Write a protein that binds this ligand. Sequence first.
Ligand SMILES: [Ca+2]
Ligand SMILES: [Ca+2]
Ligand SMILES: [Ca+2]
Length: 404
Amino acid sequence: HQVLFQGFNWESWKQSGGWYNMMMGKVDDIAAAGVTHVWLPPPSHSVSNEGYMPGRLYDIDASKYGNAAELKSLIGALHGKGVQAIADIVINHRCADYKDSRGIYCIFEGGTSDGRLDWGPHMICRDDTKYSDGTANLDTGADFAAAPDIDHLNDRVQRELKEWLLWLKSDLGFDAWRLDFARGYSPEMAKVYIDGTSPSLAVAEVWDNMATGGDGKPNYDQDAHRQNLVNWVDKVGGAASAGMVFDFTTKGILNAAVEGELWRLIDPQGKAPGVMGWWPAKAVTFVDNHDTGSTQAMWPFPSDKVMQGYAYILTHPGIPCIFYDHFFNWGFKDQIAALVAIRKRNGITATSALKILMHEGDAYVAEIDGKVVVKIGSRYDVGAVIPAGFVTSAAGNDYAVWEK
Ligand SMILES: [Ca+2]
Ligand SMILES: [Ca+2]
Ligand SMILES: [Ca+2]
């Protein structure tokens, strides 16, 4: 059994009294709903309020979400309810505390007294010329515009970053990682950090655009999009690795499929169309996150169909991730908890078997592990396709679940 929960949104850092202190009050509900792991925001000092422009990586106390004590206390309360804590790991780029001779900020401070992470411009990807001293290796991945990109090929970098990651585990209690902007560096570099710190999982944010066409809708075929993600996992180590990816292929396809185009939910081989259908043990599915949804709304799930999205991900193979706002702010708490209870009581996991029974415009129906049948779409009756022995288990706006 595995169910993730994103424990923040783009606005969390503004929570009065502190985001982590507030969350202390949400732990019991999260645990009771069957959640096994909670993804928390970038914990370190960051030039940006949300945390994605990290500087003094050991300086947790400067976080806007809360200080090291509050964080340890939230993680401790999670662990007391059997729930793990995932840290949002932002290491593609980093901001320096001090300017050098050139008057450029490229003199970093790790946040401790000694020299851990007190990097110089040699640690900056030589091709991020806006900050480097041209002596480093070339960036192994894409560049982040606003801050110096770290040269992950630099040996000191690898060592001090792994040491820091192990300290987030040892001194704060984190169990796993969410790798921010994973396109920023190579899976080979990702492998170094994952292999070097044995996290229970390392879900990577590898977000590429979806092949679209003409009007703007995404194409029905998305093998290219999910091949890339599958390939990333292979290079990070495949099955031997704790590494995995957010299933952005499924996210894109589902975004469109619910708008009366559920025929999109199956590939020509009769398999789920996203990473879920090719490597479900490595697919972390979701409805919306702090970028796609929330107040940034880069790619929001149709707001009137959000529960259909959860009926899909929570009953299906792949590891589902519930979004904070959806569980707590939209009034879907009991409905979401009930879907997770169905998943759990039926022993459904990321690798459960999927048999699609109907993939039409207003009706998607599938059977999982031959124990649960779910239906999404506006079609009133799909009874003819329900196997013998199933009885309605749960239902809401345009979705239904049956169990034997
Ligand atoms: Ca220092
Ligand atoms: Ca950069
Ligand atoms: Ca980079």
